[PDB]
Design a protein around this ligand. Sequence first.
Ligand SMILES: Cc1ncc(C[n+]2csc(CCOP(=O)(O)OP(=O)(O)O)c2C)c(N)n1
Ligand SMILES: Cc1ncc(C[n+]2csc(CCOP(=O)(O)OP(=O)(O)O)c2C)c(N)n1
Ligand SMILES: Cc1ncc(C[n+]2csc(CCOP(=O)(O)OP(=O)(O)O)c2C)c(N)n1
Lengths: 555, 555, 187, 554
Amino acid sequence: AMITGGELVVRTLIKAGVEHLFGLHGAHIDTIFQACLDHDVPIIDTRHEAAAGHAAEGYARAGAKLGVALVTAGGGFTNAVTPIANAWLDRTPVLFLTGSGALRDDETNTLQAGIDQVAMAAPITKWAHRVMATEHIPRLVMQAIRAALSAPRGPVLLDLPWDILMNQIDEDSVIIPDLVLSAHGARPDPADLDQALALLRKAERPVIVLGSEASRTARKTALSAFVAATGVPVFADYEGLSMLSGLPDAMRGGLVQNLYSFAKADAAPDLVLMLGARFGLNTGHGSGQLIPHSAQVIQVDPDACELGRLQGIALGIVADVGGTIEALAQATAQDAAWPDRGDWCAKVTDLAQERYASIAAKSSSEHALHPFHASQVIAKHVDAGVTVVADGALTYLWLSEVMSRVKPGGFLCHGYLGSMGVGFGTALGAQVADLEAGRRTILVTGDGSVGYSIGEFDTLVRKQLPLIVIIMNNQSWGATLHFQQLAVGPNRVTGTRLENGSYHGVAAAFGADGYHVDSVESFSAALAQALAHNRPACINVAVALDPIPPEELII
Amino acid sequence: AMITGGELVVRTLIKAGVEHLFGLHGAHIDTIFQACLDHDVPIIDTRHEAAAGHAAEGYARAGAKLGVALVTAGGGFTNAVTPIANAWLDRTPVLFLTGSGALRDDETNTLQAGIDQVAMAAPITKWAHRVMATEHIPRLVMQAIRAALSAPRGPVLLDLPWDILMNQIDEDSVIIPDLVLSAHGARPDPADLDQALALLRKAERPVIVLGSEASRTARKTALSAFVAATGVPVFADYEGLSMLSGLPDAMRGGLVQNLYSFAKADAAPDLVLMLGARFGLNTGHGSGQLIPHSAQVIQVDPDACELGRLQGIALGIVADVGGTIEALAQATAQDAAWPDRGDWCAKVTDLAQERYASIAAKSSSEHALHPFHASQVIAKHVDAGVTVVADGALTYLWLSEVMSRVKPGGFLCHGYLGSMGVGFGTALGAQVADLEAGRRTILVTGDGSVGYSIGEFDTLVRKQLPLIVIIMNNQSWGATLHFQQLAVGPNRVTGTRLENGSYHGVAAAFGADGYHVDSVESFSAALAQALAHNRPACINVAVALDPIPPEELII
Amino acid sequence: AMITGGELVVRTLIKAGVEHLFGLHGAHIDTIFQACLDHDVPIIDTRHEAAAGHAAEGYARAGAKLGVALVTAGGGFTNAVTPIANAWLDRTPVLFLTGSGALRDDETNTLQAGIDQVAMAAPITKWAHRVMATEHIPRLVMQAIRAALSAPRGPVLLDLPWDILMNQIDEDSVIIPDLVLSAHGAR
Amino acid sequence: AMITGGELVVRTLIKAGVEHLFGLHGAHIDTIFQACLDHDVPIIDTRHEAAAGHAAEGYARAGAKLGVALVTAGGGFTNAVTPIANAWLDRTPVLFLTGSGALRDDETNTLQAGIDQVAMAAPITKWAHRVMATEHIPRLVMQAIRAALSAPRGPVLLDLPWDILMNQIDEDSVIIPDLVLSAHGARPDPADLDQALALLRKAERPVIVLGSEASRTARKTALSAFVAATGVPVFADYEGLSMLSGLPDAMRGGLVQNLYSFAKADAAPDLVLMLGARFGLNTGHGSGQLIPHSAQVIQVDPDACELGRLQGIALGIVADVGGTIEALAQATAQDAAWPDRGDWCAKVTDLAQERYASIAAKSSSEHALHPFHASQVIAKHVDAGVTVVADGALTYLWLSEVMSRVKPGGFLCHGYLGSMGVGFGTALGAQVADLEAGRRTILVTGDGSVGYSIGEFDTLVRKQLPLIVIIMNNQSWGATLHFQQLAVGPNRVTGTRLENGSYHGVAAAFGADGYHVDSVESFSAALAQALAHNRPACINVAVALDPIPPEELI
Ligand SMILES: Cc1ncc(C[n+]2csc(CCOP(=O)(O)OP(=O)(O)O)c2C)c(N)n1
Ligand SMILES: Cc1ncc(C[n+]2csc(CCOP(=O)(O)OP(=O)(O)O)c2C)c(N)n1
Ligand SMILES: Cc1ncc(C[n+]2csc(CCOP(=O)(O)OP(=O)(O)O)c2C)c(N)n1
């Protein structure tokens, strides 16, 4: 009944409902590994702490739950910083548990000590803190969890000194708290809700735009009820996209990028209801290209700073997005009868079809396989049974054009950090979450990006995680090469070609199934085969570099 | 139509609804001074940036609105750090505007440059940011205001480089946004509200405890309706106390400290509804001495990390406190009649009376004026027309004993920072806010504490602000002297005596009315006279040092 | 022969050659006041921690030696920040000793706790550090002194948690180092 | 004559004497790539910013010069933080140039923006700063360089907003300064030097211990003169080891770890002259196990905080280590003849031989290749023409045992950060530096550690860098597995096995030569062949896991 600090950490995680961790071993954190071993809690151990951190993010995002990363002192922590930064900008709930130097050996120039890990994490976490006493562990672990899971979601760093973890205490002297935190988010004042709904009712061309906070709470039943009652088309940024999958086709606007062509069509929305979608990279900043300057904007976000950040708004509500969706469903449930939106929904559908058809008409695979065509091959397989994770740059810009007509179970793309290479770890953690969901995870990445975490094929094999890694291979850091050609000159390509290496050969050397394809027919055959087997796979797809995705020109 | 960055700052503040600033001049920020001059916006200029910062706090606290502090580069900023830290721990909405070195003269070892002011403020603000372009001023001022005013309220630092402020731009090249941020905070999910109310209904001995967030939103009408419907007695920490002033005597539990004697009376609450009162210094930490371990606790706070921080709770709700009070009032306006709680309210009343009577029975002014008796002299004048500000240590501990039976318009005491000296600036700012309300401000401070900001008598006279400064003079840093005697030994008093100086003489030399008193009669006469005139005053009250206040006895 | 952490602080100061401190009292740092009282080391107690900080600077500047400021947790520290910043830009050797919340009472929303004092001082000191063990006091005080006195001179913050200072340890279990640092600068 | 901020960066680097950069492309930093292209300054572009940062470290360490890393905004920067931290604790002069969000687009929730990069780097840099004006670029680049190169050396972060770099200015309106910073480090006061030499002369068993600052200034001629004049044996931590390579055998004490067995042999030094060797991980902390408590210590370090950090010292000198070595050589070229130290030097040698022989006696490759035997295979090839980079854990602990006997041109091991995986990028950068030195780089790494940066086989092949990567493969995160067995229990192994993957197969798929070996003979043949050709290679060496290196116990 004397137990370690690491045992306290794990008892507290278990009580909160944590079922998996992602990490990489060190002695500093062995007490946590030993406790997980005793309690049959899996730690998915990777080949890089960065992959472990991104895996915790992917688990959190695909699973709509807490992700937990576990890393050792010093380089364990510094190797997890890109995950922390990505989760920060993406509003992703991840508890990063890090080891650190023993307090009793402070300032001794010893192994792995002397990095101010909390100071480094401070600019990019909701909370970061170093534990000072073993008896504080349960309450601070639970406090850290509440911080991560509350609106807007985000990463937390809990730094656990080696002596604090190794110290033994009487188990009866420290209580392990429950996670007592309402699952229901706060909702708008009914006066604000009444005004929002009165405006929505009055609008001629209203749209809703979902952001990441809608994905985190996943109030799909309420969203469906609200959308069925009002008939208003719903768009989303990348992170909100999968929240559209259960909606009737007439009200699926798809990716918010599709609003670009509306003003030209004399069909700019006159009202926009933004639900956790921030003004920024995915929503056209303050340009009014997607969210028109002429529209009345109602914005709901848990962070008041975001409200009208880059554009004047009509009504700014601070509330949880999930709670708001529940409130909207309740208010419209016994409401009757909302205005018919048939013609407006049809216009949204037509503009989307026009975009897709136009791109189709400009895409040829005469010699090399066209990225649009390669994307269409993937789209044939995307439905509620699949999570798509997207990395690369040109790769995801092209992929995005096929993503609105399908209904993915999950879609996990770059957010604001736009950090090439995060997709592999992300997809690995998503595939873990997806085992419980019954989904197959497909990573669609670039040849450049895959190199960041290419050792994780080892992890997929050791852990028998059937992630399918599709590499869109244009022999280059492509978008950056386009930048050089477009912004500087045709003769100014430098540091951006990648004309070496057999990625499928690398995957095969780690024991994964390797495929190399270069055509619509070869690729479709390979992908069908990979999906039929419950095995990790690498599909190396030779694609053309020169095509310019629509979003590259728009961006 | 070319205008300065400083003019953009002021136009934005005006559009937000700011009517006063507190500050101290520097060339770095003169453009803001000149714009306020043009627009007839008063800047209350003090004798120390710390006093200006605390004044902005006091204005925010007394006024339930945004406070704005304005300080110059370098030492202007560093002199404001104590206000920032105090506002941080007290959840007080203050926008600290600071000058800083010109961007164009970066790294030139020049005057007032080279302090990383944002880094210094980061650990003690909701947001801290240095402005990079003159065009960004309106949107970032408004963003800062939204950050300060949103739940939980807190300080923000906006750092404005000299060139950014002096730079002139076309006034029409940038839009000045409105403050578009709902006045009504987010409320609990109805399931959570129903659960809370079910527990409140079933409880034998329920209490409500209000915290600072209740004061910031000041939902007095809703609170009155809720309390009348349920008959549940309401307590508060210092910052919540004035929120009890409009409640019937029967439901006024007063300061939460009064709960101490309940367990021995076999009367410990079985349910506690905490409305923005955190677990911490004012609520007995996790000791269960005020909030019993045996009670079911419903806690409502805008910061999830606070929920059950130090004690297990039954229901943890993240919502705005004002929004929650409105929700509770709405629900209890349409449910069944509530159980009569007259006997319980009477018990609450009896226990408070027993405490007060006990103190009265023990207190003697035979050889020197007793702090409890001096406190009683003040209490006779306290009602809705008075804001009481409290500083010192033993001074406020004694004062607290008379504050539950009166109904102050405002009560501003030390919060967690416990920083001796903050009261003078705080009271000065409070008196500015109180002007429009027809209220009179009284500072009750220690002889030690008053020394920190004693030059502010000058400011009171220059600005004709009729603040009454009452100095409880026990010729020592009192509570610290008690610590030495009680925790160390009777012969171990060092560095705590202050057996010098005529504070009324200092006040007089600055042109304020000075009084020196040493008895109930003399003090009563001085206070009556000072209150009869709209003149600043200093009342120097000789009081005994040896008496130990109940709150110290408990400790 | 059990002595407090505050006693360790003062014994280390005395061995370094410190003969005056400037400060303002708080319970958090009483163990240092008591040790100074015992050893007849004057603490010049002011009416504001800022004045105490600036006095430590003035003492250093006028006397070409180390200045030592002594302030309590929370507002004691925040009141000393203008002195820290002034000494930073002036290259003035001042050791700022500050109290802070007890480590054992971390994250309890308690009196004078919760300010990240080391983070606040980091941009304006040669070194700033929070002591984690009573036994570290003498070596870390001497390390801080070496940081302050070495070229270019400047301020250092040593943050001493209440429990770390109140803790008692066997005086024979920890050595008080000498100040072994050449008086002659490199050429 | 209008030129970009990026062009200003590169003109300043060139004027400082920078000849190589390491990095990974982004649009945010393209102006620097374009300028390097114009000026024929190579940027060695890697598959991960971490590898690029570590390459800049390796180039700095192996070359005793400034390393320059170049990364883009956001993830470019955050991917570089392990290099920054490693360089920080290793006292390695690296200029990290990072892009960042445009100032004009501040707070727009845009691509790669919103990370406070300078705040993140502040705890682990000598200086970190974000540039506010294009016109400031040359003076701030040069300022950053002076910060990195000055004693004690270390990393600097210069953050260059996208608009600051893209902005064009009249080239005639901004001067590009020279690097005007003396190459000569400051030296001790002659009174201090006199006292140090007086103590050194009176000592019965004096030793010298070198640290990283000695390697940074590389005052080899002076060191040789001082050592020849005094006859005092010289030890080093890992970073100071290659500074012993030009000394006569009699005064080569080798790695400072060898001091362990001296007290039990009644031979503990009575005087220790520490030259940039800190009290800490490599010197036995304050334990007295290497630096005896009974010895008088003279410590010379550019950071006063370090002087007697963990142990009482007799004389604490703040000076540059190189300047001090020059001063000591100068003084001992003019003073009287020094006492003969032949017997003490022979004791040092005998104790080192006794350690080596004891390990040799215990090591058997009967059933699997023993890590000590594998290490000896490598040692056969180590001389001035070789830089050895060491990663892994058990791997470098075993390797350390053969390193004191040989005289490497360079030896780059883990420092205080002990971050598994830094070796690959480090060795790639070292190989670049080694080109002009006429040296061949060999990385000796673990099967676990190699996985961190395994994509860099691609970079070796693209850039034709003939790095030889030797993977000591014990199918595990080995030292951590030993921890579980030794400190917890034999049935408590969890999260530490790595019983999968063909590393040589991975290297071959990237176009590098791959070998798989499992014996002294097969390993010897593969290494000999790899060394015979200027081609990148991976040698996957099957080695036993169970043996415990002496240092693991200690
Ligand atoms: C961590 C990081 N490093 C560098 C960049 C700069 N960058 C933007 S796009 C891009 C090219 C990505 O190439 P690839 O993964 O192959 O995708 P592609 O554009 O070719 O489809 C790069 C290097 C970045 N965004 N993040
Ligand atoms: C800024 C600051 N400095 C020092 C302290 C330590 N301290 C606590 S109580 C106290 C005495 C206050 O004396 P006074 O204002 O005269 O009030 P009294 O207790 O005598 O009524 C002191 C110095 C503090 N809390 N804050
Ligand atoms: C970045 C980082 N992650 C984890 C650790 C913990 N750690 C210490 S030794 C070790 C094992 C390294 O294994 P390998 O590289 O194969 O070397 P071996 O000990 O097997 O020879 C690990 C994971 C560390 N020191 N640094």
